[PDB]
Design a protein around this nucleic acid. Structure first.
Lengths: 260, 111, 109, 316, 183, 95, 75, 100, 78, 60, 79, 21
RNA sequence: AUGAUGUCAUACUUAUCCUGUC
């Protein structure tokens, strides 16, 4: 509310004290913490405080770690991320892996909170997702995929679909795995990509997998094809290809071939 | 090449047409259903001419148009079935020359 | 009557004929349709053979008005074929016998 | 049953305009496969007052495309694009092309190239070699569309209608080589796509009023007339986009559908602004209009004047 | 109960897409029709592999991050490197970052809808087919000729190449501007 | 099997089928219980009963070998009662 | 707590780097996320103790005799 | 969700009972399980809200205080037009924590 | 003749300017230009497999006309 | 028998001949098999092929 | 009449309840019939598509609607 | 906007002139 | 030289969760 009465020095000290409050075993503590951290982020401005967030290498997996990530998100909102991104994207360079997947999460929550404004930054994040989605280790593919999801819901309808198709290329091989978190992640991914790209392109990736001899491929591509099928079942009609008619059955729908 | 689409002449073909006391008075209105626009017509009983009272674009393909009224009521409602996954109940407000949506409940997906 | 997609019978002798193609019509319920020599095939009337109804002109309704609008999506040529400077929209619209060559000019009658 | 008609002159003949009309024999729907076709020729005597039947050249497929191209006539019968010349007994086919996918539905011929529109496939750009009389397709599209009508906007940009109620505009890349010899190598990118919601069958880019600007006037099968006008200023386009984004949140459609979902029915929207949704600012609530004008940092009469200025510049 | 691959290839109109694992399916005709579509994409190459598409890049050491020009032209990377060297602040500008994010925005190189990610996808930098009569800049530099490339002087004597018979190269039977000396 | 023909309990009596079902239950289960008689009463209460559901309910209660014979004996008596114009089985005409 | 653990992890990484420099291990390679990777064993190492324990199981040094015989035909 | 992958939703018929959220689960989404962009309110089933089952949280199942809402990312993905997502089952969560 | 041996090159040359370079004459179907691992640099000699032999004999005739980095390029049959 | 992308998994030589026959440049080779512009008819009978019109132009 | 086939349940899993989703073991004829039924339902639902289909043919709208409703069960012959 | 607006006015001028013709 | 099952540590994710009771 007031926030002017106190000099900035006091504030930044408050920051360096707030940093370790994320060991809390309680969720509401972290809640208020992050929201405050956003408020003081407004009271000061982005660069310093987001740097102080990036000081954490996410070594403590207990209590709240990703929480710092959330702070990176909300901080990126409180003043325009239109400022902040280059610092982060640079900080993916660091060879330490867990903070790499950390900044991936930061992009995820980032797009989740920004929504429409991602109509620009999509491009900036696109090649990095390429590097991340190309797999060093599974968590990269997972988290990056989540990023593709929230980006994909956020940008909808604004005409950026092309680069999302490009990213869908690199998304597509990850379809196969038994790890629950990566498979459900990929599911959310391809669902958001469904709504953003439109079903036609999806289905054009999902055709051949339906009838493939193996059981695995059929299990999965049928799971996908179901996910594509339930929603937008109304709009699928046009995109079912032409399938020739056999002896006992007529597989051509001739209604579409009536010409005036 | 950023373009801007504009409509010069509205669609005159009617896909559905209902009749009843939509205005809440003794005069009966003609709720016509065009392709991508809703139209409310009011025929003159003396002049023998039908005048367009209201014309609003629904921005969608309306596939069903029916009217209903409760027991003891004096005005007919307007049930509009479109390509969206929600059912919309409209009540033309004469004191404003606009169709006021009474209720709108979602039932499925669009298309 | 022409091929109408919807019909609305209103009070005080009014019949709205919304045509599926071409201009629409609004015939007002003039006669009741009964008290005439027209043969009224009853449901009890047996036949083994269908009551060949004669094509008699609508002598029960009177077109009070007509909403002949668009429903074609056919062809249109916008050019200044006349002597005026503003180009006219020569659009052929209709369906079968109700087809017409309508030259659309932005103005007022 | 006639399906195509064209009136032009021949290079072998003088200044006599001939009216060639292609017809079909024994046709109906998809169950009844087309039998044969014919192409009748007219003389257009008495300065276009009377037509005299000169010759009727038959064809194996039903002709659905007739267009003049450099003194000759391009005849598209089914999936065979043939260049026929004027003959004393019948139309002598000087060239032929069988690279069509299903059937040639429309043909728009540029001064140098030829653009044929398929039935279920999108239109492709084809170059006709005058030295060897061989038509070569040098460009194609990546997305199939049931095209019904098309119009050449420029030498490399072509806008075509869709049977599903949409409108698309494809522009060729500047690095495309016309001199050449999944399907094609060079692809054409779609620069504009918009679902109009009505079946469009006639497109024409011309001036509706003298002194104004030319716009993409389009017709509809439901008896509607629309017009597409390009934005002259990037700031005005951004203002119209912000006004549309404010109107999509302040005035929803009465049918419960989304405006972006209605505009993205068949193809996603790319550089398209619906002026009909912007026209509801004068019909909406005054408090909501004042809130939208405060979000746009203007006045509601200023927004009304800015909306009426584009209509006065581009329409009657 | 299962047809052979030759009988499945002779019956299919497009036999250039049939594989050896498609005979073990429950309906090879529908799989052959769906695999020969216009805008269809094939399945990944990890259907028969045992490396789970992520264990093949063990010893391959790559760079940390390749930043774009729009981020490198803002000076944030050098300031971040100076801060990391001091730890092991800047406040350069606020409108220059907005200008690099809006006005100086570079469109990245996207991919096609059928351009799926391969296994390696880094050692096969294939690009069309730079043929006879068309060369790259630098190799011009090694060649060192000012604006024919000089072994098309010997394409005079010894004759037109067997490998590309359709050939035309400038000045001989092909009557040339910039780089491209033959078509 | 014998449980594929559609039947209807509305065209047949119910009081004449209680002694044959009681004898079949006493032959199958050995003694007389109250759950099997209630299940037989509930299986014939509907106007359009289900032979497969009654066969499953009899195989769950009994062993299955005697339950299949009980279902085959109850389907034929019901078929003979529904085929007759009176609505009674063949064992009721003699006595 | 957390800072003491970060300092202990840095001291352990420094001790592992000193042990790899003293023993002169040519197969130890660093990853881009703070981990080790064995070049000769062609496997991953989760911690610094994992790469420091790859000397009894999967001895890739004994499999280099074929490459030494291919490089030099004499003993 | 996140907090629980073995939990199953009710997915029953949508009624007129507006859903509510507990004080411990306030602001959290039902499908997307996020904290930002609320666009559509949560509607509960008729059997899921009757007598002592009314006024309870959908996700937490405790005493509901404020009304629950769905995320805008789940609304645009058509994940909010499904059945009533009432938490019926409760497995591998708050079971061994009662013993300690 | 399908293959040729190519001597006297500079490591800034790689398999690509050979690809491009000899397909200027006629297409190199199989390219081989060793990468030395130890010092990570090229000695500069090449082996080329073609479609058939005619390509490569014309290649013997024309082929010794490529000068890589101001310097001479050996091409002979193999 | 020249190999191809569809004939990679062929083992028997009997199927390879049919594969090379069906692969045989699909089914086209017809750019100018009718263009002749016969002026001898000048009524309703302009029927001739490419080689027939070439022989008619070379003869007269 | 031992059938030994009680498709009841297992562990509250799967139990398909939707129509037109399909499975991994779905046949080609069943998927083609489901696609034809979905196309018939989309033709019956869309008013502009039904108008464009009835304007080409010489039949009326209600007759074409009754023909499309009658051809839904056995519109292509179950495989 | 303003600078464009100045131009916009000119833009209007052309259309108005057109009407006159 | 991958892969296989196998007893056994080690990191990582799930914004997992600490006042629950008749």
């Amino acid at each position: 509310r007031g926030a002017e009465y106190v000099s900035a020095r006091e504030w930044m000290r408050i920051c360096f004290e707030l940093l370790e409050l994320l060991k809390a075993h309680k969720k509401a503590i972290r809640r208020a913490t992050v929201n405050t951290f956003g408020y003081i982020a407004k009271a000061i401005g982005p660069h310093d405080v987001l740097a102080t967030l990036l000081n954490n290498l996410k070594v403590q997996e207990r209590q709240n770690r990703v929480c710092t990530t959330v702070a990176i998100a909300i901080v990126a909102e409180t003043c325009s991320p239109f400022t902040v991104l280059p610092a982060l994207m640079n900080e993916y360079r660091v060879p330490e892996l867990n903070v790499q997947n950390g900044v991936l999460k930061s992009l995820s929550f980032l797009f989740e909170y920004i929504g429409e404004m991602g109509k620009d930054y999509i491009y900036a994040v696109t090649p990095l997702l390429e590097d991340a989605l190309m797999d060093r280790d599974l968590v990269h593919r997972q988290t990056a995929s989540a990023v593709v999801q929230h980006m994909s819901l956020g940008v909808y309808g604004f005409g950026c679909e092309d680069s999302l198709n490009h990213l869908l290329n690199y998304v597509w091989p990850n379809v196969f795995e038994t790890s629950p978190h990566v498979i459900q992640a990929v599911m959310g991914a391809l669902e958001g990509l469904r709504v953003a790209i439109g079903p036609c392109r999806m289905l054009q990736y999902c055709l051949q997998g339906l009838f493939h001899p193996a059981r695995k491929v059929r299990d999965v591509y049928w799971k996908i094809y179901n996910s594509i099928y339930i929603g937008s079942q109304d709009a699928l009609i046009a995109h079912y290809p032409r399938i020739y008619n056999d002896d006992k059955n007529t597989y051509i729908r001739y209604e579409l071939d009536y010409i005036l | 090449m950023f373009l801007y689409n504009l409509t010069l002449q509205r669609a005159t073909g009617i896909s559905f047409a209902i009749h009843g006391n939509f205005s809440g008075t003794k005069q009966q209105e003609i709720v016509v259903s065009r392709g991508k626009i809703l139209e409310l017509l009011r025929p003159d009983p003396n002049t023998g001419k039908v005048h367009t009272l209201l014309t609003v674009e629904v921005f969608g393909v309306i596939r069903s148009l029916m009217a209903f009224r409760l027991t003891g009521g004096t005005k007919d409602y307007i049930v509009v079935g479109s390509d969206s996954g929600r059912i919309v109940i409209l009540e033309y407000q004469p004191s404003k020359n606009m169709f006021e949506k009474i209720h709108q409940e979602t039932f499925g997906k669009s298309g | 009557v022409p091929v109408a997609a919807a019909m609305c019978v209103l009070k005080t002798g009014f019949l709205f004929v919304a045509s599926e193609f071409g201009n629409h019509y609004l015939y007002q319920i003039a006669h009741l349709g009964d008290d005439d020599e027209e043969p009224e095939f009853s449901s009890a009337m047996p036949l083994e053979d269908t009551f060949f109804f004669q094509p008699r002109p609508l002598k029960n309704l009177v077109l009070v008005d007509e909403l002949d609008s668009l429903s074609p999506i056919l062809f249109c040529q916008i050019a200044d074929l006349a002597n005026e400077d503003t180009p006219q929209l020569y659009v052929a619209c209709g369906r079968g016998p109700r087809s017409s060559l309508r030259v659309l000019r932005h103005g007022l009658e | 049953a006639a399906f195509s008609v064209a009136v032009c002159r021949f290079s072998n003949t003088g200044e006599d305009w001939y009216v060639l009309v292609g017809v079909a024999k024994d046709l109906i729907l998809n169950p009844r496969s087309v039998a044969g076709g014919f192409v009748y020729t007219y003389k257009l005597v008495n300065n276009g007052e009377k037509l005299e039947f000169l010759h009727k050249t038959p064809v194996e497929e039903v002709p659905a495309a007739i267009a003049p191209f450099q003194g000759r006539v391009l005849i598209g019968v089914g999936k065979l694009l043939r260049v026929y010349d004027l003959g004393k007994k019948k139309l002598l086919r000087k060239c032929e092309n069988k690279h069509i996918a299903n059937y040639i539905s429309g043909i728009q011929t540029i001064g140098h190239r030829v653009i044929v529109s398929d039935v279920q496939e999108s239109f492709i750009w084809v170059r006709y070699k005058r030295n060897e009389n061989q038509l070569i397709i040098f460009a194609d599209d990546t997305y199939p569309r049931w095209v019904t009508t098309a119009s050449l906007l420029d030498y490399d940009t072509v806008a075509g209608a869709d049977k599903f109620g949409n409108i698309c505009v494809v522009r060729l890349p500047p690095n495309t080589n016309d001199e050449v010899d999944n399907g094609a190598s060079q692809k054409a990118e779609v620069i504009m796509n918009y679902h109009v919601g009505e079946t469009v069958l006639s497109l024409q880019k011309t001036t509706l009023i003298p002194g104004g600007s030319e716009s993409l006037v389009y017709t509809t099968l439901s008896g509607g007339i629309g017009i597409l006008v390009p934005f002259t200023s990037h700031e005005d386009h951004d203002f119209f986009q912000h006004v549309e984004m404010h109107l999509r949140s302040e005035h929803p459609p009465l049918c419960g559908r989304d405006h972006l979902s209605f505009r993205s029915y068949y193809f996603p929207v790319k550089n398209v602004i619906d002026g009909d949704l912007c026209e509801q600012f004068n019909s909406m609530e005054p408090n909501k209009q004042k809130n939208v004008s405060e979000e746009l940092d203007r006045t509601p009469p200023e927004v009304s004047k800015k909306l009426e200025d584009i209509r006065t510049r581009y329409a009657f | 109960n299962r047809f052979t691959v030759a009988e499945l290839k002779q019956l299919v109109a497009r036999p250039d897409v049939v594989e050896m694992h498609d005979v073990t399916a429950q309906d090879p005709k529908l799989l052959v029709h769906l695999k020969a579509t216009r805008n269809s994409v094939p399945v990944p190459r990890h259907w028969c592999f045992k490396r789970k598409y992520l264990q093949g890049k063990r010893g391959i050491e790559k760079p940390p991050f390749e930043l774009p020009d729009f981020i490198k032209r803002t000076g944030i990377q050098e300031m971040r490197e100076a801060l990391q060297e001091k730890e092991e602040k800047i406040d350069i500008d606020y409108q220059k970052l907005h200008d690099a994010f809006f006005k100086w925005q570079t469109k990245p190189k996207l991919t096609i809808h059928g351009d799926l990610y391969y296994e390696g996808k880094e050692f096969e930098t294939r690009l069309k087919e730079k043929k006879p009569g068309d060369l790259s800049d630098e190799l011009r530099i090694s060649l060192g000729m000012p604006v024919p490339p000089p072994w098309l002087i010997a394409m005079q004597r010894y004759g037109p190449p067997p490998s590309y018979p359709n050939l035309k190269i400038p000045g001989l039977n092909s009557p040339l501007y910039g780089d491209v000396f033959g078509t | 099997e014998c449980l594929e023909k559609k039947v209807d309990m509305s065209k047949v009596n119910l009081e004449v089928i209680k002694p044959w079902i009681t004898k079949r239950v006493t032959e199958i289960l050995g003694f007389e219980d109250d759950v099997v008689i209630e299940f037989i009463f509930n299986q014939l209460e509907v106007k359009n009963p289900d032979s497969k559901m009654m066969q499953i309910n009899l195989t769950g209660f009994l062993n299955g070998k005697n339950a299949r014979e009980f279902m085959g004996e109850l389907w034929p008596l019901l078929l003979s009662a529904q085929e007759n114009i009176a609505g009674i089985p063949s064992a009721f005409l003699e006595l | 707590s957390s800072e003491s653990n970060r300092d202990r992890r840095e001291r352990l990484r420094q001790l592992a780097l000193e042990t790899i420099d003293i023993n002169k291990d040519p197969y130890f390679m660093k990853n881009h996320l703070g981990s080790y990777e064995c070049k000769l064993c062609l496997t991953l190492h989760n911690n610094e103790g994992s790469y420091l324990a790859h000397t009894q199981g999967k001895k890739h040094q004994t499999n280099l005799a074929r490459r030494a015989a291919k490089e030099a035909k004499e003993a | 969700a996140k907090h629980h992958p073995d939990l199953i939703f009710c997915r029953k018929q949508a009624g007129v009972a507006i859903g509510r959220l507990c004080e411990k689960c306030d602001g959290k989404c039902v499908i997307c399980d996020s904290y930002v962009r609320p666009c559509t309110l949560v509607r509960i089933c008729d059997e899921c809200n009757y007598g002592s089952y009314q006024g309870r949280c959908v996700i937490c199942g405790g005493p509901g205080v404020s009304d629950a809402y769905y995320c805008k990312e789940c609304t645009i993905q058509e994940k909010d037009r499904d059945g009533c997502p009432k938490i019926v089952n409760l497995g591998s969560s708050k079971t061994d924590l009662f013993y300690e | 003749d399908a293959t040729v041996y190519v001597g006297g090159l500079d490591e800034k040359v790689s398999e690509p300017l050979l690809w491009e370079l000899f397909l200027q004459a006629g297409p190199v179907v199989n390219t081989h230009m060793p990468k030395d691992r130890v010092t990570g640099q090229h000695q500069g000699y090449g082996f080329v497999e073609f479609l058939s032999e005619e390509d490569a004999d014309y290649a013997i005739k024309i082929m010794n006309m490529i000068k890589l980095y101001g310097k001479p390029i050996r091409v002979n049959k193999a | 028998i020249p190999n191809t992308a569809h004939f990679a998994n062929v083992t028997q030589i009997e199927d390879a001949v049919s594969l090379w026959a069906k692969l045989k440049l699909q089914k086209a080779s017809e750019r100018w098999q009718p263009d002749t512009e016969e002026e001898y008819e000048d009524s309703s009978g302009n029927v001739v092929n490419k080689k027939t019109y070439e022989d008619l132009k070379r003869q007269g | 009449m031992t059938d030994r086939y009680t498709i009841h349940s297992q562990l509250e899993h799967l139990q398909s309840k939707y129509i037109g989703t399909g499975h991994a073991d779905t046949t080609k004829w069943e998927w083609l019939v489901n696609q034809h039924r979905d196309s018939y339902c989309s033709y019956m639902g869309h008013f502009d598509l039904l108008n464009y289909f009835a304007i080409a043919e010489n039949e009326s709208k209600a007759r074409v609607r009754f023909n499309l409703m009658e051809k839904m069960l056995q519109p292509c012959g179950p495989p | 906007k303003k600078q464009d607006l100045d131009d916009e006015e000119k833009t209007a001028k052309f259309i108005e002139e057109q009407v006159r013709r």
